[PDB]
């Protein structure tokens, strides 16, 4: 009888997945995921997606080919194509609009959603599909299944369609709906197949064989907040303000609205307050999960640790980079190991989030349906790339209005107090409710700006200014700038280096070491000056407190975030010293260059005598929102649907997805074999335990010995370096059974530019790109 998949277990026996069962299960699970959002369309797509496997040629292939080809016989990427039979059947048995709509989902369920005319042209595939359809229907008739196994009804689709589109379909919003249904199809297909791979009858069965609910998470959060309150009852200025913010968040959580903002002072508890708002709001309005998306130029780990401490290990899913195998190493198992964000708390970048929302491929689109009915927290949303701000805010508008999503725009840009101005965080959204509107104290820093005449300082001159000072955090705008400044510093200090040339784990270890030095510094007990050279990745969620911060010229919000690491708690008996300098030009994205330009023009307008003032912030956001092309790459008209009697439904999914890939200048992921610190069977130190680790091995020890102690705790090697070698072998044996390795490798990835080039510098392994250890240095990372 007809099968959908075949697999071979480690004892070399063969198991097969019955086709009829898989079609029914995928239909039902897709309809379940699609919920109230026109689920009949998803059901039909699940029912039809594998119709082409009824071809006798397909069943013959899956029974007669080699072991590897039999296990990968459904990966059409010669294989026997099967995805387009069900697409053609939909077109033939339904009206033009519904039929072609479904054809997009069904025919893309392996290759990704296509363009109509151009890339992967769905028009050509349909015009060439008569044989595949006829053979599939032959097979289906030959089989046992009842005549009405495919009960395709225009009228029922009409009713479901108009239930979702009360006013008919908007040609410019149609792609969001089709991508959502495509997500339902893909996630249900993959989950059912993964059930089969583990021997279970269906996805529900595997689920019941073996995540706390948001109620338990909320109770944990309350326990954690209460012990934070008791543990450090400062009864201080800062604790008072944090309390006021938390109370306003808890109050605003009851409001029946979809767009909120949370504007607080730096060090004001932005993350924990946003999480409390989100938990309570989610419980009151039936949101199913919380998504926390931070700027791409961040250390995700450092933000995620707050959530890990508040709510425990098993709840937080950390997902930033794309660890995709190259197409040539895609197998059935790697295909199934993709992320669907079914976890209740997700920590991610806004690039991962919105590039998934605009994607064509199944690996990126799988997670999409789990975003509906969620709370999404955008940390510093105003830094979303300006040139994509129109599609992104259009996306957000639709998701908030029609798909149950709540957005909270968090920013630490509350001005230093005459607060007679509001701000528009994102120029394109409907009205956004500000959570902290109750007002009212003491200054924390003094800020110095570069000269209006526009002159720049050499790296040596800036290093000389820094080296004249006992303790400085210096923040620069690019990795090369970090290298040049670090090199320029003298060798009589303790100097350290952070940039995105370093993997997360390396960064977190440097951060913990800096904490130890700082604790010594604050007791008057560090015998060398302390200089940390970092990029902007430190301003996004790293909690460090320096007495002096040097900041390269940048947008006023970036300057405020930098000052947030200078006398952060307001505990020092003198104001912090913040020096904004103008060096060699540079910036990692056109949007950050735009911020720099706005700050320069404000400086030339004499508006920055008090750079954190209400006047300064209002002027910065008005000028920023007056500048830049908000859809530079034409996303909106690429994804706007064109209809006609000849071409019922034309959308450029494939071209749009590829064009959106420029949101980060085509970032390519790269795995780096940085040997981590571990403790004794060697176990790598958990990311939120590093601080305790450094205290246990270093407290009471002279600084002159620290390095040797640290070097002794590196992950032990055998008599690629070890953890990596075992990990890659685990991926090679069975990447779905050991898919957890993928998540581990996320801490040892950096992203570089497709532009940059030695021959064996980079190799491939387990389908993933890896850098040879010779090219990754202990201080600077890669180059
Ligand atoms: Fe398929
Ligand atoms: Fe399938």
Numbering used by the authors: 4 to 80, 87 to 219, 224 to 430, 434 to 456, 461 to 700, 705 to 743, 755 to 791, 795 to 821
Which text from the study accompanies this structure?
In the present study, we elucidated the first structure of standalone Type I-C Cas3 from Neisseria lactamica (NlaCas3). Following purification, the target protein was successfully crystallized, and its crystal structure was determined at a resolution of 2.17 Å using the molecular replacement (MR) phasing method. The crystal was categorized under the space group C2, with a single molecule present in the asymmetric unit. The overall tertiary structure of NlaCas3 exhibited a typical structural fold of Cas3, compactly arranged with the N-terminal histidine–aspartate (HD) nuclease domain and RecA-like helicase domains positioned adjacent to each other, thereby forming a functional unit that is capable of DNA cleavage and unwinding. Two prominent round-shaped electron densities, characteristic of metal-ion density, were observed around the active site of HD nuclease of NlaCas3. This metal ion density was coordinated by O and N atoms from the side chains of residues H8, H25, H52, D53, H118 and H119. Additionally, ICP–MS results indicating a 2:1 ratio of Fe2+ to Mn2+ binding indicated that the metal ions in the active site of HD nuclease domain corresponded to two Fe2+ ions. Conversely, in our isolated NlaCas3 structure, Fe2+ ions, which inhibit NlaCas3 activity, were detected, indicating an inactive form. When comparing our standalone NlaCas3 structure in its presumed inactive form to the structure of Cas3 bound to the actual substrate DNA within the Cascade complex, we observed that the HD gate loop from the HD nuclease domain and RecA1 gate loop from the RecA1 domain in our NlaCas3 structure blocked the active site of HD nuclease. When we compared our standalone NlaCas3 structure with that of NlaCas3 in complex with Cascade, the anchor loop of NlaCas3, which is utilized for binding with Cas8 in the complex, underwent significant structural changes when NlaCas3 was present alone and positioned in a completely opposite direction.
Among many types of CRISPR-Cas systems, Type I CRISPR-Cas systems are most abundant, with target interference depending on a multi-subunit, RNA-guided complex known as Cascade that recruits a transacting helicase nuclease, Cas3, to degrade the target. Cas3 is a multi-domain protein consisting of approximately 800–900 amino acids in the Type I CRISPR–Cas system and is responsible for the actual cleavage of target DNA. Our structural study revealed that, like other types of Cas3, NlaCas3 is distinctly composed of three major domains including the HD nuclease domain, RecA-like helicase domain, and CTD.
